[PDB]
Amino acid sequence: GSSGSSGQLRDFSSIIQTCSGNIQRISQATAQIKNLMSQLGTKQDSSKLQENLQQLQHSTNQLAKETNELLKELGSLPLPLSTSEQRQQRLQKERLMNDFSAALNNFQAVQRRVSEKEKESIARSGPSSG
């Protein structure tokens, strides 16, 4: 893994590692929402949770915003003289993109469920005016 301290730059390895992490979190927070979800599903509810969800949501949101940004800055980086490192590079990113997705989708499928909970709350049926 990482061993040293001097360079300090958005290196492919520096970005990757970061990208990887982000993914985890995204998948993590997404898990908290699901884990916290049931919690709410206990007859009663708690704002302490509802808030946690959002916080976990937003957080992940941005996290992703960065990931995509990095994934962009990654490929942006130049290529080595050796073609061996060239493939290993894109190859890595290739997975990252996918991995990130698998995590993204998760959040999505979660976003829906959440929205649903908020859908029932508001509901809004049978208009009445006048």
- DSSP-assigned states of every residue in the chain: -----S--S--HHHHHHHHHHHHHHHHHHHHHHHHHHHHH-BSB--HHHHHHHHHHHHHHHHHHHHHHHHHHHHHHS---SSHHHHHHHHHHHHHHHHHHHHHHHHHHHHHHHHHHHHHHHH---S----
Exposure class string for 12-21: b at 16+ Cβ within 10 A, else e = beebbeebee
Q: Would you say 107 and 28 are in contact if contact means Cβ atoms under 8 Å apart?
A: no
Cβ contact 49:40 at 8 Å: yes
What is the CB neighbour count within 10 angstroms for residue 48?
Answer: 9
Q: Which residue bears the tokens 């208009």?
A: 127
Residues 4 and 1: their CA atoms lie apart, in Å, by: 10
What span, in angstroms and rounded, lies between the C-alpha atoms of 67 and 76? Answer: 14
**Residue 68 lies in domain:** 1-130
User: Domain containing 104 — which CATH number?
Assistant: 1.20.58.70
Provide CB contacts within 8 A for 25, sequence distance 6+: 59, 60, 63
Question: Can you tell me the distance from the alpha carbon of 29 to that of 53, in angstroms, rounded to the nearest whole number?
Answer: 8
Count the domains in the chain. Answer: 1
Phi first, then psi, for residue 129 (nearest 5°) are -140, 160
**The tokens of 45 are what?**
């509810």
Q: How was this structure determined?
A: NMR
- Distance CA(52)–CA(45), nearest Å, equals 12
